[PDB]
Amino acid sequence: MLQGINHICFSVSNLEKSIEFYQKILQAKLLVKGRKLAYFDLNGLWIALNVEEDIPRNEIKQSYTHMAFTVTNEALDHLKEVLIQNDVNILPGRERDERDQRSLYFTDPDGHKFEFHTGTLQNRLEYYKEDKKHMTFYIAGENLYFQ
Amino acid sequence: MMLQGINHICFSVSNLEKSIEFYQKILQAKLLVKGRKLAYFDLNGLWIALNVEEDIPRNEIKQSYTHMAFTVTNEALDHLKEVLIQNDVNILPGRERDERDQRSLYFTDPDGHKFEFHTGTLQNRLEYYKEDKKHMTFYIAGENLYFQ
Ligand SMILES: C[C@@H]1O[C@@H]1P(=O)(O)O
Ligand SMILES: C[C@@H]1O[C@@H]1P(=O)(O)O
Ligand SMILES: [Zn+2]
Numbered sequence A: 001m002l003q004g005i006n007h008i009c010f011s012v013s014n015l016e017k018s019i020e021f022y023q024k025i026l027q028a029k030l031l032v033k034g035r036k037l038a039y040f041d042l043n044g045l046w047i048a049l050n051v052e053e054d055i056p057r058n059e060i061k062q063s064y065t066h067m068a069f070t071v072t073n074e075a076l077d078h079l080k081e082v083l084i085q086n087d088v089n090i091l092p093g094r095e096r097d098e099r100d101q102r103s104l105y106f107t108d109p110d111g112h113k114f115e116f117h118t119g120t121l122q123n124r125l126e127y128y129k130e131d132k133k134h135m136t137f138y139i140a141g142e143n144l145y146f147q
Numbered sequence B: 001m002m003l004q005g006i007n008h009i010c011f012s013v014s015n016l017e018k019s020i021e022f023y024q025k026i027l028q029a030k031l032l033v034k035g036r037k038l039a040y041f042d043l044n045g046l047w048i049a050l051n052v053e054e055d056i057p058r059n060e061i062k063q064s065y066t067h068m069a070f071t072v073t074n075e076a077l078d079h080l081k082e083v084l085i086q087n088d089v090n091i092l093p094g095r096e097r098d099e100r101d102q103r104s105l106y107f108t109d110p111d112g113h114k115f116e117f118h119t120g121t122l123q124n125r126l127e128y129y130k131e132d133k134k135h136m137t138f139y140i141a142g143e144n145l146y147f148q
């Protein structure tokens, strides 16, 4: 089996500009930088940036593939401000239901999509659990009267 | 304000049936829920989601080194290489490794997301890189030198 997440690595075109984004925006802690790499600690997670300077980065804009980090509601508000102050590319979200809970989607300088999300997986499940529930009328097992 | 850690990762996939089977059999993620265009998993406590996007272009991704790595033991790495080959997993040859890198296997899901099974830690790596800086260091300000 697998023992858990080891690291996540991002291919970047401009190591110094990306180091500043990962520090400023994702609040990652720098550990070591080289000529073509950077390692950071993000709340226990090992994040690596590796340079690929002349590669195409325009189809990445089409895919919803993304990574989300946990934030509170006030934190989301303060981070939207931060992403505005720092000229980050902020994506318009998909439509959301209230029970979806709040998110902010944005990308790094090379198009990797990130999200700040205020909920949990179980919230997302209780949400779907509740709507299954809303579509159930005979609780098999229940006792019916007048029979 | 603050971040608290990885909430989830979402992979855009083209074929939901084929992808769920990949994440189940290769990554060993536990499917928790399934729909027309989504599927949610739990893998060792990580929320993994697939969201279908049938008709986007998925060429350039193969040219990018961004990837996600999971920790495994060395025997597990051997086991997993056979699992991948048997299930016809696109295995990549990987970069050149110092033995000090620790062993790895790189490969892709069917839509080109790169993954890695790794047998080292950030600790191992930083210590490897530091043990290199030590090797190129010859004097210690501090010690009792012998003739000044
Ligand atoms: C650890 C940084 O991701 C790179 P590697 O997998 O090439 O070592
Ligand atoms: C949870 C799966 O990532 C998708 P969402 O960010 O659109 O909810
Ligand atoms: Zn998401």
Ligand SMILES: [Zn+2]
Pocket: A007, A009, B067, B068, B069, B116
């Ligand atoms: Zn790696």
